[PDB]
């Protein structure tokens, strides 16, 4: 087929948060039809980062989402061509993260290219001081709109002091070629940071995603 039961992927990122520019390269793998995947990111430029890694982790792959048989896998059918998506995360303290991404297939591996812009994070906020410690389990509400696939998340970050730190996320997924759009359904996601060095210049992640609907 086009999407084998085990697919690898490479990711390229250029971004800037509160003026500090950076670049990140990474490689990963996973089982697309099972909804599991891992990755190993490396800060190749601008490291170490003066902000929390947690705002970058959700930007490194919804081709690895376990879908029910009656829900069209819109982002799997988009291949071998691929798809693009845009994301805006509005954090509770005014911080805004802006993401664009291109997904393609080259020689049996997915190729990800990401561009990020973070802005208006308070200097004493949990982001610019790395007072965060991972994302909680999220539920993304998928729905078709304007010939594309859109999602809305009420994401929550854990704080080292025991509190939480929320963000409203909206994403629009559009296939490069016209394929079947699904109905309204939910996607349950859990993203974990499995390992990292001292200054978060080498980070590994793990994500489990599964779709469901009535």
């Amino acid at each position: 087929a086009i999407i084998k039961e085990f697919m690898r992927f490479k990711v390229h990122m250029e971004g800037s948060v509160n003026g500090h520019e950076f670049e990140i390269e990474g490689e990963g793998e996973g089982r697309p039809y099972e909804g599991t995947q891992t990755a190993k990111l490396k800060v190749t430029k601008g490291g170490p980062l003066p902000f929390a890694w947690d705002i970058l982790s959700p930007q490194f792959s919804k081709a690895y989402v376990k879908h029910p048989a009656d829900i069209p896998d819109y982002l799997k059918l988009s291949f071998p061509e691929g798809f693009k998506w845009e994301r805006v995360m509005n954090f509770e303290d005014g911080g805004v993260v802006t993401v664009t991404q291109d997904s393609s297939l080259q020689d049996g591996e997915f190729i990800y290219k990401v561009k990020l812009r973070g802005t208006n994070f308070p200097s004493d906020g949990p982001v610019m001081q790395k007072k965060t410690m991972g994302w909680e389990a999220s539920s993304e509400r998928m729905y078709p709109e304007d010939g594309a696939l859109k999602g809305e998340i009420k994401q929550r970050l854990k704080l080292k002091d025991g509190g939480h730190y929320d963000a409203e996320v909206k994403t629009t997924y559009k296939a490069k070629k016209p394929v079947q759009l699904p109905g309204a359904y939910n996607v349950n996601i859990k993203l974990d940071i499995t390992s990292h060095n001292e200054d978060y210049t080498i980070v590994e992640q793990y994500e489990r995603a599964e779709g469901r609907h009535s």
Partner: nanobody
Amino acid sequence: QVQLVQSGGGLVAGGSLRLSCAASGRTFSDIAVGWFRQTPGKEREFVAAISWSGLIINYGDSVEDRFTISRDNAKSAVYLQMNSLKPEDTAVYYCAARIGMNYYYAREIEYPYWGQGTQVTV
């Protein structure tokens, strides 16, 4: 590919002027629009820009709060509502178009498709 034709130009202190720009060829859903302006020269500065999903609305400097950009994939056109027009905004405005969004939006050369030109005289 993408072709642009601007409209809505005219004359107006502290008024309203809806500038527009239509597109043909590539599907609007894959085209990112931009806006630049030059008064007698004095450097073509960045006005506003929108992404291909409408979620990313990078504005400029003086246009903060005053101006606003919006797109409609049904009519395949972008709109730059200019409100509270100050005399210093008297310039000729241009509409440019990219394809694949613009991490950097103030680079004119990164917008390959340009348009004609509409003059705003406050």
